[PDB]
Amino acid sequence: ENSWQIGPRTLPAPSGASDVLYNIISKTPTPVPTINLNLVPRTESEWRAAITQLDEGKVDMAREISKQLSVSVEHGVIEGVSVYYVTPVEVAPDLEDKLFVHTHGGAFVLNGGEAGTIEAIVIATLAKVRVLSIDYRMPPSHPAPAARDDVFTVYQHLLKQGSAQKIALGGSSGGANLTMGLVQHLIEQEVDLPGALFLGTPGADMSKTGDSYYINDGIDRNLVTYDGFLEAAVRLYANGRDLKDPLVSPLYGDLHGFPPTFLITGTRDLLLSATVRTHIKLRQSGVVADLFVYEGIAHGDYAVDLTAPETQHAFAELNAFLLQHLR
Amino acid sequence: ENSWQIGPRTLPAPSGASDVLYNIISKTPTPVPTINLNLVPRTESEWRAAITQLDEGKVDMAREISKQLSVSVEHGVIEGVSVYYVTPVEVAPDLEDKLFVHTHGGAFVLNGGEAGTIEAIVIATLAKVRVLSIDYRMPPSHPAPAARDDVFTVYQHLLKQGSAQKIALGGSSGGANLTMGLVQHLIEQEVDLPGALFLGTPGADMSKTGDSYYINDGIDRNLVTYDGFLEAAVRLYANGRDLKDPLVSPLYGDLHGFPPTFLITGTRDLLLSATVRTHIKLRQSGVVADLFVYEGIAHGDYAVDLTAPETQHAFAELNAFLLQHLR
Ligand code: NA
Ligand code: NA
Ligand code: NA
Ligand code: NA
């Protein structure tokens, strides 16, 4: 109760953002925290229903972007793990022998299958690099650490094929969580590390620790609130582990030895704190880490409209970051 | 009215911050907007009283830190401009021939005289570099562009003595504003630029534009709110100019050609948006710009307690930043 009671605030669309983002936000209704507050699956069957509902239309969006941008998206399997090969029409000359291994976002149970390729498609086209998106097994059907295992399995296979230094690894939210956890494991096991990491709005701390969980409650148009669904998803993922257990919230683990890391979030992101806390911990641990925070941007909004100047800039920066660090 | 109405929120002290910062925040009472809402000087006499009131105790803190850290703070005059030579006991070997020219924060009327040396002392001692803090003339007695002129006068004098490349320039809030405006002037006039800039919580856009003005209203324990005093101070500074005039809000000006820039802010900063929008605009303009956002930190909180790990880290990064860019 040493906490602050903040009165109601009024939040206008941000004229500081691009016209594209300003218009997106301006057309977004005030986020409604009761939906996510009331979406609390308890049974595996309720989970399957919630998940389907939340994933609705994702595949359609993915294919639409793919067709429009001439991105090839092809399902395959690597050592039993579902993957998607995502090839853009233009691969940067110096990224021609490089690979971006992508781990999709969503809160640990979302974006299975082709639904998870949206961000991979964005990265592929705009960062001009081939992407391999890992369709890792998720709860409720496949409790942790099935997802962790899948990412590790694909990564190990890739190292049989070529140098880890030519590989970038990452993604957003829950996938960024697996990415951080994987890298920590690799460092422990003295396995070769990726040449670079991408952590977009990472689910780095899934306990309700972080200013933005409180400050941006009702302000992040996508996650809206930690309470209800997100916490339930986190707890499903945690599978009995403490939420500050580094296996659940990798921010609490050691970040020394991390490859150069690129992080992105925005002023309205519920995971803004998770992101900047991670960026700071990386820097404090002697890691090259570049942070980008976009005015107006909520969780994942940097990869929702390819015409946003924010998005075009962000991935042009990612491209430059991959050119600098991958070899 | 395309705005979102956000319900009241509860903001606990941030466990993700350092213990030092957590205890500082935890001991800070809920910010109270009404005070700054009611502090609205209209007359020059009322300004002088408001300013005196707000500056109260600053010199004492400056002197206390100085003594405690063995920092020499010496008043002088350069071409008629009041300055403070701030010399730390330890200057980094490769910063021995370098100089950090500091422009104090406060909202355009505050921290005159020795009161302005606090951040200079923190920078000098933690970044291990000599600081020359410019005590520029401010409203109400000296309307803009007196401050602008004073900073330019000192800078021009310094270029007569040595290479601009050996000089870093910057500070926070209002001073950061002058810094941005000065560099834009220098670029226009084809004058040699500093080797590096420091923009802490910059007053880069002083119109009420920026998510953080709204999101962090009542959450920044220092500025608290834009309404009332801060707006009054901005308008006094503007002196009839539009608040988006680049001479008032340099974010709106051209940032191409800027030297490498180091920016710092935090999750609770009312000027978080000003900061990240500047960082993004700099990066979009081909400028080297490194952003640091600290969980829990509000306007200027990165230079308020030298024992905070946030502060120690931030200025160790600044040190590394100056070592890389000054030559
Ligand atoms: Na930024
Ligand atoms: Na001031
Ligand atoms: Na002054
Ligand atoms: Na940060």
Side-chain angles (χ1 to χ4, degrees), chain A residues 136-172:
Chain A
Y136 45 83
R137 288 169 300 143
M138 290 181 292
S141 303
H142 314 274
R148 163 185 192 93
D149 289 345
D150 288 354
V151 175
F152 179 74
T153 291
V154 170
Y155 187 76
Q156 279 233 297
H157 171 83
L158 294 170
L159 293 214
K160 275 176 72 261
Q161 244 93 137
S163 169
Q165 185 63 30
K166 293 183 187 298
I167 294 178
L169 168 69
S172 58

mmCIF file of all heavy atoms in Angstrom, chain A residues 136-172:
data_model
loop_
_atom_site.group_PDB
_atom_site.id
_atom_site.type_symbol
_atom_site.label_atom_id
_atom_site.label_comp_id
_atom_site.label_asym_id
_atom_site.label_seq_id
_atom_site.Cartn_x
_atom_site.Cartn_y
_atom_site.Cartn_z
ATOM 1 N N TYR A 136 6.691 -23.875 -32.474
ATOM 2 C CA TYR A 136 6.989 -24.712 -31.332
ATOM 3 C C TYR A 136 5.719 -25.167 -30.650
ATOM 4 O O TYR A 136 4.697 -24.479 -30.691
ATOM 5 C CB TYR A 136 7.881 -23.957 -30.342
ATOM 6 C CG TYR A 136 7.435 -22.531 -30.070
ATOM 7 C CD1 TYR A 136 6.446 -22.259 -29.135
ATOM 8 C CD2 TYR A 136 8.006 -21.459 -30.751
ATOM 9 C CE1 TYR A 136 6.036 -20.959 -28.873
ATOM 10 C CE2 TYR A 136 7.603 -20.144 -30.497
ATOM 11 C CZ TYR A 136 6.616 -19.908 -29.552
ATOM 12 O OH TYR A 136 6.218 -18.622 -29.277
ATOM 13 N N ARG A 137 5.794 -26.329 -30.014
ATOM 14 C CA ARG A 137 4.647 -26.895 -29.318
ATOM 15 C C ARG A 137 4.338 -26.057 -28.086
ATOM 16 O O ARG A 137 5.250 -25.649 -27.360
ATOM 17 C CB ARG A 137 4.935 -28.352 -28.907
ATOM 18 C CG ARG A 137 4.968 -29.368 -30.057
ATOM 19 C CD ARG A 137 5.526 -30.731 -29.587
ATOM 20 N NE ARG A 137 6.884 -30.587 -29.072
ATOM 21 C CZ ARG A 137 7.388 -31.251 -28.031
ATOM 22 N NH1 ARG A 137 6.649 -32.135 -27.372
ATOM 23 N NH2 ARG A 137 8.645 -31.024 -27.650
ATOM 24 N N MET A 138 3.053 -25.820 -27.839
ATOM 25 C CA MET A 138 2.635 -24.938 -26.763
ATOM 26 C C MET A 138 1.622 -25.599 -25.835
ATOM 27 O O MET A 138 0.927 -26.529 -26.231
ATOM 28 C CB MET A 138 1.996 -23.674 -27.353
ATOM 29 C CG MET A 138 2.958 -22.734 -28.067
ATOM 30 S SD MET A 138 2.068 -21.271 -28.684
ATOM 31 C CE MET A 138 1.052 -22.020 -29.959
ATOM 32 N N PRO A 139 1.512 -25.097 -24.598
ATOM 33 C CA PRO A 139 0.386 -25.510 -23.753
ATOM 34 C C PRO A 139 -0.913 -25.076 -24.427
ATOM 35 O O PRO A 139 -0.884 -24.155 -25.258
ATOM 36 C CB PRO A 139 0.594 -24.706 -22.462
ATOM 37 C CG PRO A 139 2.005 -24.220 -22.505
ATOM 38 C CD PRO A 139 2.353 -24.075 -23.958
ATOM 39 N N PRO A 140 -2.052 -25.688 -24.054
ATOM 40 C CA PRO A 140 -2.208 -26.691 -22.991
ATOM 41 C C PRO A 140 -1.837 -28.109 -23.421
ATOM 42 O O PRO A 140 -1.551 -28.931 -22.554
ATOM 43 C CB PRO A 140 -3.712 -26.639 -22.697
ATOM 44 C CG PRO A 140 -4.321 -26.291 -24.002
ATOM 45 C CD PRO A 140 -3.361 -25.265 -24.587
ATOM 46 N N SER A 141 -1.853 -28.390 -24.721
ATOM 47 C CA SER A 141 -1.602 -29.744 -25.217
ATOM 48 C C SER A 141 -0.175 -30.184 -24.936
ATOM 49 O O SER A 141 0.071 -31.355 -24.665
ATOM 50 C CB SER A 141 -1.877 -29.835 -26.724
ATOM 51 O OG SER A 141 -3.208 -29.453 -27.042
ATOM 52 N N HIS A 142 0.768 -29.246 -25.021
ATOM 53 C CA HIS A 142 2.181 -29.557 -24.802
ATOM 54 C C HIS A 142 2.776 -28.632 -23.767
ATOM 55 O O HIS A 142 3.290 -27.550 -24.098
ATOM 56 C CB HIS A 142 2.984 -29.476 -26.109
ATOM 57 C CG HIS A 142 2.324 -30.171 -27.258
ATOM 58 N ND1 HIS A 142 2.480 -31.520 -27.502
ATOM 59 C CD2 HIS A 142 1.489 -29.707 -28.217
ATOM 60 C CE1 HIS A 142 1.780 -31.853 -28.573
ATOM 61 N NE2 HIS A 142 1.170 -30.771 -29.027
ATOM 62 N N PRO A 143 2.719 -29.055 -22.501
ATOM 63 C CA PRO A 143 3.198 -28.223 -21.397
ATOM 64 C C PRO A 143 4.666 -27.892 -21.576
ATOM 65 O O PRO A 143 5.407 -28.661 -22.201
ATOM 66 C CB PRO A 143 3.001 -29.127 -20.175
ATOM 67 C CG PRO A 143 1.879 -30.044 -20.565
ATOM 68 C CD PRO A 143 2.088 -30.303 -22.031
ATOM 69 N N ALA A 144 5.085 -26.747 -21.055
ATOM 70 C CA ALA A 144 6.504 -26.444 -21.003
ATOM 71 C C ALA A 144 7.183 -27.671 -20.383
ATOM 72 O O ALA A 144 6.565 -28.362 -19.573
ATOM 73 C CB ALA A 144 6.731 -25.216 -20.156
ATOM 74 N N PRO A 145 8.445 -27.950 -20.754
ATOM 75 C CA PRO A 145 9.285 -27.166 -21.653
ATOM 76 C C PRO A 145 9.260 -27.679 -23.089
ATOM 77 O O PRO A 145 10.282 -27.602 -23.758
ATOM 78 C CB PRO A 145 10.677 -27.390 -21.069
ATOM 79 C CG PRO A 145 10.632 -28.829 -20.642
ATOM 80 C CD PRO A 145 9.188 -29.103 -20.210
ATOM 81 N N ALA A 146 8.127 -28.189 -23.562
ATOM 82 C CA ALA A 146 8.053 -28.635 -24.950
ATOM 83 C C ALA A 146 8.500 -27.539 -25.945
ATOM 84 O O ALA A 146 9.272 -27.801 -26.874
ATOM 85 C CB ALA A 146 6.656 -29.135 -25.277
ATOM 86 N N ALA A 147 8.030 -26.312 -25.745
ATOM 87 C CA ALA A 147 8.408 -25.220 -26.641
ATOM 88 C C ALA A 147 9.912 -24.969 -26.585
ATOM 89 O O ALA A 147 10.584 -24.877 -27.608
ATOM 90 C CB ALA A 147 7.630 -23.925 -26.298
ATOM 91 N N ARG A 148 10.433 -24.850 -25.371
ATOM 92 C CA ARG A 148 11.867 -24.708 -25.170
ATOM 93 C C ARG A 148 12.614 -25.797 -25.934
ATOM 94 O O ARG A 148 13.570 -25.518 -26.666
ATOM 95 C CB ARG A 148 12.163 -24.795 -23.673
ATOM 96 C CG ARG A 148 13.607 -25.075 -23.265
ATOM 97 C CD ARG A 148 13.643 -25.253 -21.747
ATOM 98 N NE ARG A 148 14.993 -25.242 -21.202
ATOM 99 C CZ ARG A 148 15.612 -24.157 -20.745
ATOM 100 N NH1 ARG A 148 15.007 -22.969 -20.763
ATOM 101 N NH2 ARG A 148 16.847 -24.262 -20.272
ATOM 102 N N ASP A 149 12.172 -27.040 -25.762
ATOM 103 C CA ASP A 149 12.824 -28.181 -26.410
ATOM 104 C C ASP A 149 12.826 -28.037 -27.928
ATOM 105 O O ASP A 149 13.847 -28.264 -28.586
ATOM 106 C CB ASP A 149 12.141 -29.505 -26.017
ATOM 107 C CG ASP A 149 12.404 -29.900 -24.564
ATOM 108 O OD1 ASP A 149 13.328 -29.335 -23.935
ATOM 109 O OD2 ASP A 149 11.678 -30.778 -24.054
ATOM 110 N N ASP A 150 11.674 -27.668 -28.477
ATOM 111 C CA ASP A 150 11.546 -27.471 -29.916
ATOM 112 C C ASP A 150 12.488 -26.417 -30.456
ATOM 113 O O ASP A 150 13.135 -26.615 -31.495
ATOM 114 C CB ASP A 150 10.114 -27.114 -30.292
ATOM 115 C CG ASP A 150 9.181 -28.299 -30.173
ATOM 116 O OD1 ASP A 150 9.690 -29.407 -29.905
ATOM 117 O OD2 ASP A 150 7.958 -28.118 -30.352
ATOM 118 N N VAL A 151 12.580 -25.290 -29.765
ATOM 119 C CA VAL A 151 13.493 -24.263 -30.236
ATOM 120 C C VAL A 151 14.927 -24.780 -30.182
ATOM 121 O O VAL A 151 15.681 -24.642 -31.140
ATOM 122 C CB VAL A 151 13.332 -22.944 -29.470
ATOM 123 C CG1 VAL A 151 14.388 -21.965 -29.910
ATOM 124 C CG2 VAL A 151 11.938 -22.373 -29.729
ATOM 125 N N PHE A 152 15.292 -25.418 -29.080
ATOM 126 C CA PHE A 152 16.634 -25.983 -28.969
ATOM 127 C C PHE A 152 16.908 -27.009 -30.074
ATOM 128 O O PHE A 152 17.978 -27.014 -30.683
ATOM 129 C CB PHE A 152 16.823 -26.612 -27.594
ATOM 130 C CG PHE A 152 18.168 -27.240 -27.397
ATOM 131 C CD1 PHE A 152 19.288 -26.454 -27.206
ATOM 132 C CD2 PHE A 152 18.310 -28.616 -27.401
ATOM 133 C CE1 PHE A 152 20.533 -27.028 -27.025
ATOM 134 C CE2 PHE A 152 19.552 -29.198 -27.218
ATOM 135 C CZ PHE A 152 20.663 -28.401 -27.025
ATOM 136 N N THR A 153 15.927 -27.867 -30.338
ATOM 137 C CA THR A 153 16.069 -28.909 -31.356
ATOM 138 C C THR A 153 16.384 -28.315 -32.714
ATOM 139 O O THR A 153 17.308 -28.749 -33.396
ATOM 140 C CB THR A 153 14.777 -29.755 -31.461
ATOM 141 O OG1 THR A 153 14.625 -30.535 -30.274
ATOM 142 C CG2 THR A 153 14.826 -30.686 -32.651
ATOM 143 N N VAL A 154 15.622 -27.300 -33.107
ATOM 144 C CA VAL A 154 15.850 -26.672 -34.396
ATOM 145 C C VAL A 154 17.201 -25.974 -34.420
ATOM 146 O O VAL A 154 17.957 -26.081 -35.391
ATOM 147 C CB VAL A 154 14.732 -25.669 -34.742
ATOM 148 C CG1 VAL A 154 15.116 -24.845 -35.966
ATOM 149 C CG2 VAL A 154 13.439 -26.408 -34.986
ATOM 150 N N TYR A 155 17.519 -25.266 -33.347
ATOM 151 C CA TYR A 155 18.807 -24.576 -33.283
ATOM 152 C C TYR A 155 19.986 -25.553 -33.417
ATOM 153 O O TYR A 155 20.910 -25.317 -34.195
ATOM 154 C CB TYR A 155 18.934 -23.779 -31.987
ATOM 155 C CG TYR A 155 20.171 -22.918 -31.934
ATOM 156 C CD1 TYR A 155 20.240 -21.728 -32.656
ATOM 157 C CD2 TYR A 155 21.270 -23.291 -31.169
ATOM 158 C CE1 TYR A 155 21.369 -20.934 -32.620
ATOM 159 C CE2 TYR A 155 22.401 -22.503 -31.120
ATOM 160 C CZ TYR A 155 22.441 -21.319 -31.846
ATOM 161 O OH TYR A 155 23.563 -20.522 -31.809
ATOM 162 N N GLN A 156 19.955 -26.644 -32.654
ATOM 163 C CA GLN A 156 21.031 -27.633 -32.735
ATOM 164 C C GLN A 156 21.180 -28.156 -34.147
ATOM 165 O O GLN A 156 22.291 -28.287 -34.657
ATOM 166 C CB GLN A 156 20.786 -28.799 -31.777
ATOM 167 C CG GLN A 156 21.186 -28.498 -30.342
ATOM 168 C CD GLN A 156 22.139 -29.542 -29.759
ATOM 169 O OE1 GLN A 156 21.784 -30.724 -29.623
ATOM 170 N NE2 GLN A 156 23.357 -29.109 -29.414
ATOM 171 N N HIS A 157 20.054 -28.458 -34.784
ATOM 172 C CA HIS A 157 20.088 -28.940 -36.155
ATOM 173 C C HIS A 157 20.784 -27.945 -37.064
ATOM 174 O O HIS A 157 21.608 -28.323 -37.893
ATOM 175 C CB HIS A 157 18.682 -29.227 -36.669
ATOM 176 C CG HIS A 157 18.627 -29.533 -38.133
ATOM 177 N ND1 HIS A 157 18.893 -30.784 -38.643
ATOM 178 C CD2 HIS A 157 18.335 -28.748 -39.201
ATOM 179 C CE1 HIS A 157 18.771 -30.762 -39.958
ATOM 180 N NE2 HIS A 157 18.428 -29.538 -40.322
ATOM 181 N N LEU A 158 20.450 -26.668 -36.905
ATOM 182 C CA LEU A 158 21.038 -25.634 -37.740
ATOM 183 C C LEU A 158 22.554 -25.546 -37.579
ATOM 184 O O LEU A 158 23.266 -25.354 -38.562
ATOM 185 C CB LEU A 158 20.381 -24.275 -37.456
ATOM 186 C CG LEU A 158 18.905 -24.187 -37.847
ATOM 187 C CD1 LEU A 158 18.281 -22.910 -37.307
ATOM 188 C CD2 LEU A 158 18.751 -24.274 -39.368
ATOM 189 N N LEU A 159 23.041 -25.686 -36.348
ATOM 190 C CA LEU A 159 24.482 -25.663 -36.101
ATOM 191 C C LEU A 159 25.215 -26.830 -36.766
ATOM 192 O O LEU A 159 26.397 -26.711 -37.078
ATOM 193 C CB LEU A 159 24.796 -25.649 -34.608
ATOM 194 C CG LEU A 159 24.404 -24.383 -33.840
ATOM 195 C CD1 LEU A 159 25.387 -24.095 -32.727
ATOM 196 C CD2 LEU A 159 24.309 -23.199 -34.773
ATOM 197 N N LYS A 160 24.526 -27.951 -36.973
ATOM 198 C CA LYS A 160 25.097 -29.055 -37.744
ATOM 199 C C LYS A 160 25.338 -28.607 -39.181
ATOM 200 O O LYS A 160 26.202 -29.144 -39.876
ATOM 201 C CB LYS A 160 24.168 -30.281 -37.737
ATOM 202 C CG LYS A 160 24.333 -31.207 -36.535
ATOM 203 C CD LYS A 160 23.308 -32.365 -36.532
ATOM 204 C CE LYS A 160 23.598 -33.434 -37.599
ATOM 205 N NZ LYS A 160 22.772 -33.302 -38.848
ATOM 206 N N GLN A 161 24.575 -27.604 -39.605
ATOM 207 C CA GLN A 161 24.518 -27.174 -41.004
ATOM 208 C C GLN A 161 25.477 -26.044 -41.344
ATOM 209 O O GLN A 161 25.875 -25.892 -42.499
ATOM 210 C CB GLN A 161 23.106 -26.680 -41.330
ATOM 211 C CG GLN A 161 22.356 -27.491 -42.358
ATOM 212 C CD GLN A 161 21.504 -28.570 -41.731
ATOM 213 O OE1 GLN A 161 20.358 -28.779 -42.134
ATOM 214 N NE2 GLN A 161 22.058 -29.267 -40.741
ATOM 215 N N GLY A 162 25.808 -25.221 -40.355
ATOM 216 C CA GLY A 162 26.580 -24.019 -40.606
ATOM 217 C C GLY A 162 26.873 -23.244 -39.341
ATOM 218 O O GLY A 162 26.506 -23.664 -38.251
ATOM 219 N N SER A 163 27.534 -22.103 -39.489
ATOM 220 C CA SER A 163 28.014 -21.341 -38.347
ATOM 221 C C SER A 163 26.896 -20.596 -37.619
ATOM 222 O O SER A 163 26.056 -19.951 -38.247
ATOM 223 C CB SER A 163 29.067 -20.331 -38.808
ATOM 224 O OG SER A 163 29.361 -19.407 -37.767
ATOM 225 N N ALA A 164 26.911 -20.665 -36.292
ATOM 226 C CA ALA A 164 25.923 -19.967 -35.475
ATOM 227 C C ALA A 164 26.034 -18.459 -35.684
ATOM 228 O O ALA A 164 25.068 -17.716 -35.505
ATOM 229 C CB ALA A 164 26.125 -20.311 -34.004
ATOM 230 N N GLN A 165 27.218 -18.009 -36.079
ATOM 231 C CA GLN A 165 27.478 -16.579 -36.218
ATOM 232 C C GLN A 165 26.711 -15.971 -37.385
ATOM 233 O O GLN A 165 26.537 -14.750 -37.465
ATOM 234 C CB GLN A 165 28.985 -16.331 -36.360
ATOM 235 C CG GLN A 165 29.379 -14.868 -36.387
ATOM 236 C CD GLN A 165 29.039 -14.145 -35.101
ATOM 237 O OE1 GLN A 165 29.030 -14.743 -34.023
ATOM 238 N NE2 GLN A 165 28.755 -12.846 -35.208
ATOM 239 N N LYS A 166 26.240 -16.825 -38.288
ATOM 240 C CA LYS A 166 25.461 -16.372 -39.427
ATOM 241 C C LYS A 166 23.979 -16.320 -39.086
ATOM 242 O O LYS A 166 23.139 -16.015 -39.941
ATOM 243 C CB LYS A 166 25.668 -17.304 -40.617
ATOM 244 C CG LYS A 166 27.088 -17.273 -41.187
ATOM 245 C CD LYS A 166 27.198 -18.161 -42.416
ATOM 246 C CE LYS A 166 28.653 -18.264 -42.889
ATOM 247 N NZ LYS A 166 29.187 -16.943 -43.300
ATOM 248 N N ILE A 167 23.663 -16.645 -37.840
ATOM 249 C CA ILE A 167 22.275 -16.781 -37.429
ATOM 250 C C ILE A 167 21.854 -15.687 -36.468
ATOM 251 O O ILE A 167 22.532 -15.430 -35.466
ATOM 252 C CB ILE A 167 22.039 -18.153 -36.774
ATOM 253 C CG1 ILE A 167 22.230 -19.263 -37.812
ATOM 254 C CG2 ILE A 167 20.641 -18.227 -36.138
ATOM 255 C CD1 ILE A 167 22.073 -20.652 -37.239
ATOM 256 N N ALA A 168 20.737 -15.033 -36.785
ATOM 257 C CA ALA A 168 20.059 -14.183 -35.815
ATOM 258 C C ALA A 168 18.874 -14.963 -35.248
ATOM 259 O O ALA A 168 18.282 -15.796 -35.920
ATOM 260 C CB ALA A 168 19.596 -12.853 -36.450
ATOM 261 N N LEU A 169 18.541 -14.698 -34.001
ATOM 262 C CA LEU A 169 17.477 -15.426 -33.351
ATOM 263 C C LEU A 169 16.585 -14.464 -32.598
ATOM 264 O O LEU A 169 17.056 -13.617 -31.837
ATOM 265 C CB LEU A 169 18.082 -16.419 -32.351
ATOM 266 C CG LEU A 169 17.118 -17.079 -31.364
ATOM 267 C CD1 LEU A 169 16.187 -18.030 -32.102
ATOM 268 C CD2 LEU A 169 17.870 -17.819 -30.257
ATOM 269 N N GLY A 170 15.287 -14.602 -32.765
ATOM 270 C CA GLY A 170 14.422 -13.910 -31.848
ATOM 271 C C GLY A 170 13.023 -13.698 -32.334
ATOM 272 O O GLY A 170 12.561 -14.343 -33.268
ATOM 273 N N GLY A 171 12.336 -12.793 -31.658
ATOM 274 C CA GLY A 171 10.936 -12.553 -31.925
ATOM 275 C C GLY A 171 10.373 -11.747 -30.785
ATOM 276 O O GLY A 171 11.052 -10.884 -30.242
ATOM 277 N N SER A 172 9.152 -12.056 -30.382
ATOM 278 C CA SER A 172 8.428 -11.150 -29.518
ATOM 279 C C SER A 172 7.698 -11.892 -28.420
ATOM 280 O O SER A 172 7.499 -13.106 -28.503
ATOM 281 C CB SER A 172 7.456 -10.330 -30.359
ATOM 282 O OG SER A 172 6.569 -11.198 -31.046
#
